[PDB]
């Protein structure tokens, strides 16, 4: 209840930065080699050498449903005083052991390993449920630390309706009201089936997507694309180009003038050189394919707003969450004054509302779409000017509705009576 607004459509129970200040850099950074407890990135990690805080306020995170589908972490936390909903992906291979059914004596406990960073029927259901919880009644801003590499394509998981619960994520995302921030963290991945169910084009009016500078995201893993787009023959065409030994041996076969016992030599010399170059030549294509799935490419194709540095994530989101929460409410109030009763791939949060163009000119700040800090400070100062412009628009809209009330001949009859 400390995270929930006192009423229904009331602003969140926000306080000053006070214990954990907003102007602090995110100290805990996750390792790229092994697995890490994703919870440390949210609140902080308790270590032998001091304490490294997360991107939310120290000990403000409250994990829920932690006994079911631990492959996804759900909870509520505070960001410099601002309370909000959190969804993160567990990287470690968790194991849920289903109990033995006593009704059937031929039933034993089933040991099942829910491998980390993947979506399972139960994990997808958990995700879908959490979203509904954070929007209905609660009405909290959402932060998703996206790290899934797809869905569990296994026969058992498929038969267990993985597809049905996957859709329930998409359904729940269009239903959402308040701002949603999809942020791929450092080391975080977003491949194939995973990205689709979280893309900002689902609900552009409330979604906003960001990615870390050292995060990865493609249609498939760079190890998966190589046996389809950069096959053995494509690697050898590039081998007879970069390697000096292989292209020199290629010039021997092309020149001819060598017998059946002589042509066998060139074949047995190359098909030994190419066998030793193959492992490192393979890894080259892996690095090559990874450069497609880099953070820079994402901003270039406009699938994300900005590339983010994990260190100053807290500092950026504190003002962007605050800017969006005040703005969303002002825009909702603009429409309530105008009408007292999105359409393309181009639908980006800077074009989430058609009143943001009018609000832009009323504010008068050049870096309006950006400079989140400068925007927030302005609204607090010109509290009267916005309320003033709302009442201007309210009376202007009443004049339009009364004029529209065939309809003239009917009014001429209702007046003559």
């Amino acid at each position: 209840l400390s995270f929930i607004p006192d009423q229904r459509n009331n602003p969140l129970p926000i306080l000053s930065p006070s214990p954990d200040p907003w102007d602090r850099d995110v100290v805990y950074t996750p390792p790229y080699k092994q697995t890490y407890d994703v919870r440390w990135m949210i609140a902080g990690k308790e270590d032998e050498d001091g304490f490294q805080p997360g991107l939310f306020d120290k000990d403000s995170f409250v994990e829920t449903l932690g006994g079911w589908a631990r492959t996804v972490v759900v909870g509520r936390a505070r960001l410099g005083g601002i309370p909000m909903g959190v969804i993160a992906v567990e990287t470690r291979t968790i194991e849920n052991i289903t109990p033995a059914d006593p009704a059937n004596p031929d039933s034993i406990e089933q040991v099942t390993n829910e491998a980390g960073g993947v979506w399972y029927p139960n994990s997808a259901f958990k995700t879908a449920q959490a979203i509904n919880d954070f929007n209905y009644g609660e009405q909290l801003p959402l932060m998703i630390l996206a790290n899934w590499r797809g869905f569990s394509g296994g026969q058992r998981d498929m038969y267990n309706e993985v597809l049905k619960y996957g859709s329930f994520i998409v359904d729940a995302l269009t239903r959402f009201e308040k701002p949603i921030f999809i942020y791929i963290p450092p080391h975080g991945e977003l491949r194939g089936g995973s990205w689709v169910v979280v893309d900002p084009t689902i609900n552009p009016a409330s979604m906003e997507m960001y990615a870390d500078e050292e995060a990865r995201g493609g249609v498939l893993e760079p190890e998966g694309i190589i046996p389809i787009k950069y096959k053995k023959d494509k690697q050898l065409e590039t081998m007879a180009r970069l390697d000096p030994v292989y292209r020199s041996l290629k010039k021997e076969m092309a020149k001819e003038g060598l017998s059946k016992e002589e042509s066998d030599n060139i074949k047995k010399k190359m098909q030994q050189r190419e066998e030793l170059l193959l492992p490192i030549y393979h890894q080259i294509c892996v690095q090559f394919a990874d450069l497609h799935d880099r953070a820079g490419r994402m901003k270039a194709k406009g699938v994300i707003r900005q590339s983010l540095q994990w260190r100053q994530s807290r500092r950026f989101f504190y003002w962007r969450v605050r800017r969006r929460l005040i703005e969303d409410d002002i825009l909702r109030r603009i429409e309530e004054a105008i009408n007292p009763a999105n359409t393309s791939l181009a639908a980006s949060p800077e074009t989430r509302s058609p009143h943001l163009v009018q609000l832009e000119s009323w504010v008068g700040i050049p870096g309006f779409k950006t400079n989140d800090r400068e925007v927030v400070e302005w609204y607090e100062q010109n509290q009267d000017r916005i309320n003033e412009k709302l009442e201007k628009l309210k009376k202007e809209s009443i004049a339009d509705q009364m004029r529209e009330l065939x309809x003239x001949x009917x009014x001429x009859x209702x007046x003559x009576x």
Binding site: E161, V219, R297
Partner: protein
């Protein structure tokens, strides 16, 4: 001497500059090519002309024209046997100077148009195609509308008209006579209507002497050089008049269609060119299609018709470079779909017509008397294709089957069902399994969305026919034979590589296709690749964005309008989800609803667990877990079952 982009109505791909008469010069790039030189040799006599050839070539370190002034004797074949001895003699003289074309101008003092003879290529074999017409005149004649044919010209008494024997390059069964004519304006209102009668009679008389022979179809093109004030609405009324007189004669010659190109100053004033296609389909013309030549903003001149017809014709908003499709062209595609156990996308409208035909035939039995509202075999359904407009906004087109610009096709079908015998509408969207594995690209996504969006806006149901391969995969092919490697040790490359860089010369070639950082190693200006962008679309995130958009759209649509999907073939990745978001689904017995490939799972596990895509995607899984609502014996049985819903 060339603009080859904002120039006269032509089609250009990537970076290329070609000639007017020579449609295929050098596409590579014209950044390194010698300037074209214009030469004109006026010679008094045909024999004396040889001295103005061998001496004429001496001032050449290209295009050469030769004018003749003897209006006295105009030979044919005898003129050809009088110009060939000079070209075979100087076969190395013309070759050394690297000149492409050799034109010949022969004018008459009685007002007769000059005769042209053009020699082209290495040996200069004389292309019989360009005759009695100028390089300038090679554009109006176009001949780029007959690329899918092997042309052999035939003799014409009138130098203005040219007839060609076109044969299908692939399949030989196609044999047609295509006529190409140019009307040049008379120097110094009922002029054009009478001019049309004279030129069409000349074509008719010429088609008569060569004979009708064996032609499946016959076409004639007439291009106007004069910009006489045309009021197409007056032209259309007058058109009806003379076509009914010539029509019978044209019907004997096996002529199926005629295309006129007139320029209208009444819009100096802007001259709006208006094309018109008159087809003799079902014995009676009833096809007066009045078009308008306008740019598609993509650099192509398209066919925007404001016809006198009911707008349910054929060909709409298509570039001016159409190749006139050959018969049996549809068959190779149909085969690519049929090997996968699915009907070719454009064969489905027929399947639906028969399923509606079937829906009546039983209703007339069950319910006697109440049957007379049946609309015959045909006219059961009234379909019209859907292709994205200029401003990404969908439009109703009735063009030829196939020729889909994207790997997704839609139709607006008005089926006269026994429930709504006056008509009922709906949208049908399907993936072309033959068009890039049926994979979802951004073009395919924007289309699928705009279709869902429309079905929603109109309240009519939407039907999706799934046969895809998830999202499009891809790598940058242009950077494969250009990128360099920086090793720890150059002698032994297996000792690990530091990074991947690009040569300065190869860096300037792209720059926007690859994000590169400069770091000097071994005293070299090495531009290390820090991120790959790639020129081509549909490789990574661009596909996922679009996939997410259509995923959400289907989720939204289900809650408003009637949504149905049909697994006509393997439905993978994003496609698999649109079947579930579409909620109501019909699965054809031998088609799987797979997420991750059967061998891809085996490679991941490191052991051969699954052996089939249907072992985890088939009916025995999806119908048994409730993803599939019904199982259909064949692709048609699917259609039939939805017709019932």
């Amino acid at each position: 001497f060339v603009p080859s982009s904002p120039a006269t109505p032509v089609e250009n791909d990537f970076k290329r500059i070609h000639s007017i008469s020579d449609m295929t010069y050098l596409a590579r790039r014209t950044r390194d090519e010698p300037i074209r030189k214009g030469v004109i040799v006026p010679c008094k006599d045909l024999l004396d002309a040889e001295e103005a050839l061998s001496r004429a070539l001496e001032v050449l370190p290209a295009v050469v024209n030769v004018a003749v002034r003897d209006a006295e004797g105009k030979n044919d074949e005898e003129i050809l046997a009088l110009i060939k001895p000079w070209v075979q003699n100087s076969k190395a003289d013309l070759l050394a100077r690297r000149v492409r074309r050799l034109t010949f101008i022969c004018g008459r003092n009685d007002g007769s148009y000059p005769s042209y003879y053009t020699f082209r290529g290495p040996d200069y074999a004389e292309d019989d195609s360009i005759r009695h017409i100028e390089p300038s005149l090679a554009f109006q004649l176009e001949l780029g509308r007959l690329s899918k044919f092997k042309l052999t010209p035939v003799f014409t008494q009138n130098k203005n008209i040219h007839v060609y024997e076109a044969v299908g390059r692939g399949v030989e069964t196609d044999r047609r006579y295509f006529t190409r004519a140019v009307v040049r304006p008379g120097r110094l209102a009922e002029y054009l209507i009478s001019e049309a009668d004279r030129v069409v009679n000349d074509i008719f008389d010429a088609l008569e002497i060569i004979g009708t022979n064996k032609t499946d179809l016959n076409h004639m093109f007439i291009n106007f050089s004069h910009t006489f004030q045309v009021t197409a609405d007056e032209v259309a009324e007058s058109l009806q008049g003379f076509l009914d007189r010539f029509g019978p004669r044209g019907w004997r010659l096996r002529v199926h269609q005629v295309e006129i190109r007139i320029n209208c100053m009444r819009s100096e004033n802007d001259t709006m060119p208006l094309r018109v296609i008159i087809t003799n389909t079902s014995g009676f013309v009833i096809q007066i299609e009045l078009y308008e030549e306008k740019l598609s903003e993509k650099g192509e001149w398209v066919y925007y018709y404001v016809s006198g017809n009911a707008k349910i014709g054929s060909m709409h908003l298509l570039p001016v470079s159409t190749p006139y499709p050959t018969k049996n062209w549809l068959q190779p595609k149909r085969y690519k779909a049929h090997i996968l156990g699915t009907q070719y996308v454009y064969d489905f409208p027929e399947l639906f017509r028969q399923a509606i035909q079937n829906s009546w035939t039983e209703a007339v039995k069950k319910i006697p008397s109440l049957a007379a509202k049946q609309p015959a075999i045909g006219e059961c359904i009234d379909y019209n294709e859907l292709v994205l407009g200029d401003q990404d906004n969908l439009a109703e087109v009735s063009r030829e089957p196939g020729m889909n610009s994207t790997g997704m096709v839609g139709w607006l079908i008005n089926a006269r069902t026994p429930e709504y015998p006056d008509g009922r509408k709906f949208i049908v969207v399907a993936n072309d399994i033959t068009f890039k594995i049926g994979s979802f690209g951004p073009k395919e996504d924007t289309f699928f969305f705009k279709c869902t969006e429309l079905a929603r806006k109109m309240g009519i149901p939407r039907i999706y026919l799934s046969a895809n391969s998830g999202a499009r995969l891809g790598l940058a092919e242009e950077l494969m034979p250009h990128f360099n490697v920086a090793w720890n040790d150059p002698a032994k490359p297996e000792a690990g590589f530091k990074y991947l860089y690009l040569s300065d010369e190869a860096k300037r070639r792209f720059e926007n296709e690859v994000i590169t950082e400069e770091i000097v190693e071994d005293g070299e200006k090495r531009h290390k690749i820090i991120t790959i962008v790639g020129a081509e679309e549909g490789l990574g995130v661009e596909c996922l964005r679009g996939s997410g958009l259509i995923a959400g759209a289907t989720s939204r649509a289900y809650n408003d309008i009637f949504t149905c999907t049909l697994v006509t073939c393997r439905s993978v990745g994003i496609g698999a989800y649109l079947v579930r978001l579409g909620q109501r689904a019909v699965q054809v017995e031998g088609q799987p609803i797979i997420l991750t490939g059967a061998p891809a799972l085996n490679s991941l596990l490191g052991r051969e667990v699954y052996t089939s895509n249907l072992q985890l995607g088939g009916t025995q899984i999806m119908y048994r877990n409730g993803v599939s609502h019904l199982t259909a014996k064949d692709d048609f049985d699917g259609v039939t079952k939805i017709v019932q819903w």
